[PDB]
Write a protein that binds this DNA or RNA. Structure first.
Ligand SMILES: Nc1ncnc2c1ncn2[C@@H]1O[C@H](COP(=O)(O)OP(=O)(O)OP(=O)(O)O)[C@@H](O)[C@H]1O
Ligand SMILES: Nc1ncnc2c1ncn2[C@@H]1O[C@H](COP(=O)(O)OP(=O)(O)OP(=O)(O)O)[C@@H](O)[C@H]1O
Ligand SMILES: [K+]
Ligand SMILES: [Mg+2]
Ligand SMILES: [Mg+2]
Ligand SMILES: [Zn+2]
Lengths: 176, 639, 624
DNA sequence: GTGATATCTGCTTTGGGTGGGTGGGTGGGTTGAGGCAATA
């Protein structure tokens, strides 16, 4: 898996948009997308939201968790704890990147939101680094990584798994 | 506090090992041999207690203090009287220190308060001076004795104690020092410099200052290549209540190692068998094996082997002297491998000093005066030939040396002594060395139609001081050209097994030795197609390591001349000297003199050494006569 | 309190700059540049970052203005902010990495530099940007950042006393703080520095000479003292051209006039520059550069491209420009198992007529070579070329100073006016040219230095212009020196109507084009890139001859020797140009240089063919 | 109560290279190697 594919998975999350067009209910294979009425909010997958924004057909609304006070509390909690804390979204980094890159005009205080998400990302990456070092140094056979998102795992997963494969083979040399 | 007690407990546990017994036995030996320093291998400590080893290497002074306290307690446990004998017991370290292996360039501030192992060359030494440790004083009026302890920034527990001795008691009654009851330790300072081959491009080598105390004094002399294990400290100072904040740094040694072969029984048996195998072929094989990368100059290589082996110097009951050192001169056309043979001897001989005619002076060759670092005392520093005492001096571009500088070489070349009469200093220095010199003729390229004396352009006395003189000519011969070209191109195609294709030699190198003992013998070198060719390999090559061991063992033998050899040598000397115009074309390169007879004796003795024989026999004399016959005459071409 | 509040506010602003600064656009993406660099460097174990002044001005103009006007205090605040941000980016950390490290903040700007001559009193204590040449570097020494002091009498200790940066000392407390009652009073000056409690950093001192083009007419170049510390230490070496950002400062020694200070003028002080950032001027390889170099080496006509790029202003000399290219790249240095070395450097001599651009070629190679020294034979001495023995002013002891061939170690030394050199001075170079070492035995010093450099020499003939009738009398050099040259070019100014017209038009167009704004040439490589390409190849590729190429070389060498031997016999005079084993190894070196241009591990038969053609045009032509 | 006059306190000295060669050798330190001009 590469980062583009994790972003592809993240693009299936639902967000809210206000369209400037009228459309009847669409019966997509994935699921119905309610009628579109100018000025009224509607929930759609992130990929369709980004596409409609790029075509000047909708205005995006920030998710509930994309709030400065909530994000500051979450960053402080993440810094205080030892393990990974539960995240507002399983694709918070990708959602933040896409929404703030394409609709900053629609999201007030986007710079603060980006900085807080960056802080959380840095803390969690450091925790994952500590976890990997502990796994190798203490010669573990298994680990628990709860509340860790797919993008975080994918950032260094291949390296860690290859190292663990080599280490296991070195641990099982003497068995005939 | 508690950490110090725990460290002392751990170290005492480490040295009480009868329940494998290596350090219990080492301490017993220390007692038996009258020593007060125990050398500890950090690998054993790391094996038995890793945390204690890491702390020792990273917090050196406190850990060493605890270690030495524990050692004193253990020694007292084995024998209390011996412990009372010595003020303190010291600990030296050896083994692998990981990243603490450094050079004077890589020894930086990040290694402060750490144990480090430095490798380098000793450039400067100082005089040994006593340093007061404990002072004892007696009061004649009150009949009581008082003791004082001293320490400085250089002691393990740094504290700037006062140097002034007590002179009176708290009561006014006066005090007198008991010098024979006080304690003093020897103290010396040296400088260790980066190895020039390791320096980066365009950079002069860096240096570090080292402090040797107690037994470690005089373990190293200038010119040595040493490995010093010690602790790295800064010496902060103040003046008028002001500090610059820039501090000198010193290395406080705990162990000094040299970088004298060690012989095992198997190696001794191999050497004895090699000597026994052949009677006449040993010398020829050894000479053939000397500098493999040079296509043959066979007689010159035999002469260089004789030079390395040497003769036997005679001391007479009256006190007269006859030298045993063999001197060789090579005069030649450009590009005939003279400098390469000199460089090979420089790389292989145990003590060899390089010198260039244009880059040397009489002072630099013999000795120099300067002010002592302390007290400004007129002191002497050894020159090249004194540093080469019982060694070799290789002088390249001999014809470029100034005549006045050349004249200073006569006394060393003949008598082996240097007389210093300057700056209120009158000394006789021992410079008993063999001279290997290379030169070009007066016209650059030897003129065969002129005589040897006119080409060489040197005075007969200097030529007489050389045991052998070799005229090496480049004669364009298609077959010789083919052979030399094949050899040279094979040499240039060679690639060492470790290296990969396309690799370039770097300018400079990082520290490669990662232990005090090298973690890594066979008589004959393994065959390599490029190094030796596709020939059937009928001639075998003796390996470099075996050659180094064999020559060391042979140099100690002193063959005794026999009556038959003496008769043959006398007859041959008479024939050599009487023969005038022995060949009408032939001319003498050097005059035949009684020095020629001494040279015959020297060469025969060296040949007998090569065989490891206790007597000089007729074969050795015949070989010496053959060498002299080849060297002393040259045909002159007529146009 | 108020000062503390102001300092805290400024530190907060620096911290926010480090946390929030970003590069990119909403069309492409965004990167938190300085936070990311700090995080990566800290993880790598390199505790420094480099901050652009323009970025800081973009974030907060007042902060940049303060940093320019009062560098010391605001730089300290910026370093504290950097330490804070480094903790947050890496804060959960693995075992053995608990203690947070200090961060050195380097400074970089796009502003135009100012000269040494322009450094005036009114700029004291300001941030300055200065170009120059490094002429001297000191040894690495230890400078205290933190000290602990202890009382001689009572053993009362004051710990963690901060030290000022730069060439500034500290004044110890005059009196101790122990209780007056009960104990006999503590003596004056009771405090001493505890050796093992001191925290130190590496420091260095440098001399920076003004640029040669900036020197006023008729004046000796001026220099300035530089103070470097931590990661700035040991970055530059003598000969480097640099631009330094620093603080114009004054040495703060003891207030007292100890030893009865007796200066020639009153109230004078010693100036220096406290270095905050270094930029080495062209006059590590990025992956983009390395890919570009690999592309060049793979061009089918790379040899032609490099030759066309050597002194493009000179009208002709194609064979001499091809040989200079080989000298610039060099051969492969080797060490045989017995310990004997074979040199890989190539030596070249141009002997010829006046006004044939020999000196212009030497000047170009000085600029083009990664390491290059230009000297004159007339203005040289034996000690100046190799190395000198002299007295050290501070120590009162003999030391060693390297000459031209020590400064040019690893590069090229261009010796112009080689014929004007004295015979005693010329002879001092024989060892360095072949053994590539310098042996010294003088004044109690016995040492050996490295001199692995290529010699490029130019000279005139004995009678000024080469006279064909005089024959061997045209050359005055001894056989020993001449055998140490891989290639010898006899340059004859041949008069021809057609070539002379072409050359004149080229020279006129060259003088008119001096006004034209510089433009690139499709078939050439600019000097800056060619200089970097040469350095890359020399470190990456050491070629060897192929077994088939060796057989071809062996047979031609034998023929060449016979022809030289026959020619001398017929002429009845031993030729001035010898053909020895050194000339065989010279052809090997030239073949390896041609392969090194193409980054090829093995030299082919075509490489040997070109090497033999170069030898034929240069040295065999001279010898016959 | 003022004028000595006796006691006490702090400064800096030494020649030295961690105090500089951006103090100066008319303020004072052997030995040797290295450029000059005049020299032969
Ligand atoms: N017979 C030979 N066998 C092997 N290599 C040789 C031989 N002759 C010369 N060479 C090589 O050729 C070069 C000769 O240079 P070298 O310095 O040894 O010559 P030299 O005789 O000392 O010359 P000079 O009198 O000019 O200093 C070196 O590379 C040497 O390795
Ligand atoms: N072929 C040429 N193409 C371009 N310019 C040339 C050429 N030959 C000479 N010049 C120019 O003419 C002048 C020649 O002076 P230069 O010092 O380079 O000559 P030189 O050959 O080294 O002479 P000398 O032996 O007298 O020192 C310079 O201006 C050089 O640029
Ligand atoms: K002074
Ligand atoms: Mg030579
Ligand atoms: Mg010129
Ligand atoms: Zn006190």
């Amino acid at each position: 898996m590469d980062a583009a594919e994790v972003e592809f998975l993240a693009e299936k999350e639902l967000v809210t948009i206000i369209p400037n067009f009228s459309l009847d209910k669409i019966y997509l294979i994935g699921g119905d997308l309610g009628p579109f009425n100018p000025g009224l909010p509607v929930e759609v997958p992130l990929w369709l939201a980004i596409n409609l924004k790029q075509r000047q057909k909708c205005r995006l609304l920030p998710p509930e968790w994309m709030d400065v006070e909530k994000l500051e509390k979450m960053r402080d909690h993440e810094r205080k704890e030892e393990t990974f804390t539960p995240m507002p979204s399983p694709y918070y980094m990708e959602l933040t990147k896409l929404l703030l890159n394409h609709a900053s005009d629609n999201i007030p205080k986007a710079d603060e939101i980006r900085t807080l998400v960056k802080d959380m990302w840095d803390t969690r990456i450091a925790k994952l680094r500590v976890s990997a070092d502990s796994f190798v140094r203490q010669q573990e056979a298994h680990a628990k990584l709860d509340n860790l998102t797919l993008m975080e795992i994918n950032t260094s997963g291949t390296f860690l798994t290859q190292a663990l494969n080599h280490m296991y083979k070195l641990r099982t040399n003497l068995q005939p | 506090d508690v950490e110090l007690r725990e460290a002392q407990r751990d170290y005492l546990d480490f040295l009480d090992d009868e329940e494998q017994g290596i350090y219990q036995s080492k301490v017993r030996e220390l007692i038996s041999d009258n020593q007060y320093r125990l050398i500890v291998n950090v690998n054993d400590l790391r094996r038995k207690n890793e945390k204690r080893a890491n702390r020792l290497l990273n917090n050196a002074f406190e850990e060493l203090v605890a270690f030495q306290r524990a050692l004193k307690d253990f020694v007292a446990s084995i024998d209390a009287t011996y412990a009372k004998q010595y003020e303190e017991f010291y600990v030296g370290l050896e083994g692998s220190f990981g990243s603490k292996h450094v050079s004077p360039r890589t020894l930086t501030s990040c290694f402060l308060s750490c144990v480090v192992c430095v490798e380098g060359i000793v450039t400067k030494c100082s005089l040994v001076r006593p340093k007061v440790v404990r002072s004892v004083h007696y009061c004649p009026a009150t009949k009581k004795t008082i003791e004082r302890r001293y320490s400085d920034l250089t002691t393990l527990v740094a504290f700037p104690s006062s140097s002034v001795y007590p002179t009176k008691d708290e009561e006014n009654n006066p005090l007198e020092t008991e010098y024979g009851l006080s304690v003093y330790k020897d103290h010396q300072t040296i400088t260790i410099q980066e190895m020039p081959e390791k320096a980066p491009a365009g950079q002069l080598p860096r240096s570090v200052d080292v402090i040797l105390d107690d037994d470690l004094v005089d373990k190293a002399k200038p010119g040595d290549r040493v490995q010093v294990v010690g602790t790295y400290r800064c010496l902060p100072g103040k003046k008028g209540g002001y500090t610059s904040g820039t501090f000198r740094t010193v290395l406080i040694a705990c162990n000094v190692k040299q970088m004298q072969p060690s012989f095992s029984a198997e190696d001794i048996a191999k050497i004895k068998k090699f000597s026994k195998t052949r009677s006449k072929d040993i010398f020829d094989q050894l000479a053939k094996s000397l500098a493999p990368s040079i296509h043959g100059h066979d007689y010159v290589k035999k002469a260089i082997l004789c030079l390395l082996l040497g003769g036997v110097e005679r001391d007479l009951e009256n006190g007269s002297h006859i030298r045993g050192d063999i001197n060789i001169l090579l005069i030649g056309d450009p590009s005939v491998a003279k400098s390469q043979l000199l460089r090979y001897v420089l790389c292989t001989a145990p003590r060899a000093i390089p010198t260039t005619g244009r880059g040397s002076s009489g002072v630099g060759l013999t000795a120099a005066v300067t002010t002592d670092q302390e007290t400004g005392e007129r002191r002497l520093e050894a020159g090249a030939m004194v540093l080469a005492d019982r060694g070799v001096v290789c002088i390249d571009e001999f014809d470029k040396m100034s005549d006045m500088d050349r004249t200073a070489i006569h006394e060393v070349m003949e008598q082996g002594r240097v007389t210093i009469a300057k700056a209120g200093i009158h000394a006789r220095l021992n410079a008993r060395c063999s001279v290997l010199a290379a030169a070009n003729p007066v016209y650059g390229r030897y003129d065969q139609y002129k005589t040897p004396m006119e080409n060489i352009g040197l005075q007969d006395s200097l030529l007489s001081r050389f045991d052998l003189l070799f005229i090496m000519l480049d004669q364009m011969d298609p077959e010789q050209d083919r052979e030399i070209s094949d050899h040279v191109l094979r040499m240039h195609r060679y690639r060492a097994p470790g290296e990969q294709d396309g690799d370039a030699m770097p300018l400079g190198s990082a520290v490669d030795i990662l232990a005090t003992d090298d973690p890594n013998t066979q008589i004959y070198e393994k065959h390599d197609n490029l190094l030796h060719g596709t020939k059937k390999k009928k001639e075998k090559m003796v390996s470099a390591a075996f050659m180094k061991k064999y020559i060391h063992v042979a140099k100690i033998i002193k063959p005794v001349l026999t009556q038959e050899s003496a008769t043959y040598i006398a007859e041959e000397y008479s024939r050599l000297r009487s023969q005038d115009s022995m060949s009408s074309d032939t001319a003498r390169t050097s005059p035949v003199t009684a020095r020629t007879l001494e040279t015959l004796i020297r060469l025969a003795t060296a040949h007998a050494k090569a065989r490891m024989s206790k007597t000089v026999d007729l074969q050795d004399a015949e070989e010496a006569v053959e060498l002299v016959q080849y060297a002393y005459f040259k045909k002159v071409l007529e146009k | 309190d108020e000062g503390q509040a102001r300092k805290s506010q400024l530190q907060r602003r620096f911290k926010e700059f480090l946390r929030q600064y970003r590069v990119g656009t909403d069309r492409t993406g965004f990167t938190f540049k300085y936070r990311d660099e700090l995080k990566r460097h800290y993880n790598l174990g390199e505790y420094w970052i480099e901050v652009e002044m323009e970025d800081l001005a973009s974030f907060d103009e007042d902060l940049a203005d303060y940093l320019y006007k009062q560098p010391a205090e605001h730089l300290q605040l910026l370093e504290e902010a950097a330490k804070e941000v480094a903790d947050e980016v890496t804060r959960p950390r693995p075992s053995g990495e608990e203690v947070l490290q200090d961060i050195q903040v380097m400074l970089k700007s796009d502003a135009s530099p100012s000269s040494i001559r322009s450094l005036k009193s009114d700029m004291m204590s300001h941030l300055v940007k200065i170009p120059g040449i490094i002429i001297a570097a000191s040894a690495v020494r230890a400078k205290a950042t933190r000290i602990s002091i202890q009382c001689r009498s009572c053993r009362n200790t004051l710990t963690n006393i901060a030290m000022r940066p730069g060439l500034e000392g500290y004044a110890l407390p005059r009196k101790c703080n122990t209780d007056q009652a009960g104990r006999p009073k503590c003596p004056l000056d009771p405090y001493f520095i505890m050796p093992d409690k001191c925290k130190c950093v590496d420091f260095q001192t440098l001399k920076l000479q003004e640029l040669p083009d900036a020197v006023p007419h008729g004046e000796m170049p001026r220099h300035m003292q530089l103070y470097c510390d931590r990661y700035l230490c040991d970055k530059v070496v003598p000969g480097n051209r640099v631009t330094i950002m620093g603080i114009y400062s004054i040495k703060k020694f003891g207030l007292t006039t100890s030893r009865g200070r007796d200066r020639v003028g009153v109230g004078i002080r010693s100036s220096y520059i406290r270095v905050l950032g270094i930029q080495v001027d062209t006059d590590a390889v990025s992956p983009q550069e390395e890919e570009e170099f690999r592309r060049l080496a793979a061009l089918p006509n790379v040899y032609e491209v490099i030759s066309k790029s050597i002194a493009p202003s000179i009208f002709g000399g194609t064979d001499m420009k091809k040989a200079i290219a080989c000298l610039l790249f060099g051969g492969s240095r080797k060490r045989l198992p017995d310990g004997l070395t074979r040199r890989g450097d190539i030596n070249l001599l141009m002997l010829g007529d006046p006004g044939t651009a020999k000196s212009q070629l030497l000047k170009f190679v000085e600029k083009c070579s990664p390491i290059g020294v230009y000297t004159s034979g007339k203005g040289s001495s034996a000690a100046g070329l190799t190395a000198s023995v002299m007295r050290d002013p501070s120590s009162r002891n003999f030391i060693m100073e390297g000459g031209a061939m020590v400064l040019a170690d690893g590069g090229v030394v261009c010796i112009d006016e080689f014929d004007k050199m004295r015979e005693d001075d010329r002879v001092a170079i024989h060892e360095a040219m072949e053994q590539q070492t310098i042996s010294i035995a003088k004044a109690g010093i016995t040492t050996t230095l490295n001199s692995r450099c290529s010699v490029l020499a130019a000279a005139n003939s004995v009678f000024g212009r080469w006279d064909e009738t005089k024959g061997e009398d045209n050359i005055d050099f001894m056989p020993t020196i001449l055998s140490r040259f891989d290639m010898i070019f006899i340059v004859k100014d041949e008069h021809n109507e057609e070539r002379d017209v072409m050359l004149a038009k080229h020279v006129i167009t060259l003088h008119v084009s001096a006004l034209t704004q510089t433009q690139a040439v499709e078939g050439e490589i600019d000097l800056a890139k060619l200089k970097k390409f040469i350095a890359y190849c020399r470190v990456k590729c050491g070629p060897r001859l192929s077994a088939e190429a060796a057989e071809k070389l062996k047979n031609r060498y034998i023929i060449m020797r016979s022809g030289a031997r026959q020619h001398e016999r017929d002429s009845d005079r031993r030729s001035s140009i010898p053909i020895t084993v050194r000339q065989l190894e010279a052809i090997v070196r030239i073949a390896e240089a041609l392969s090194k241009m193409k980054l090829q591990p093995f030299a082919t038969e075509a490489d040997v063919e070109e090497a033999l053609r170069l030898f034929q045009v240069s040295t065999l032509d001279a010898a016959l």
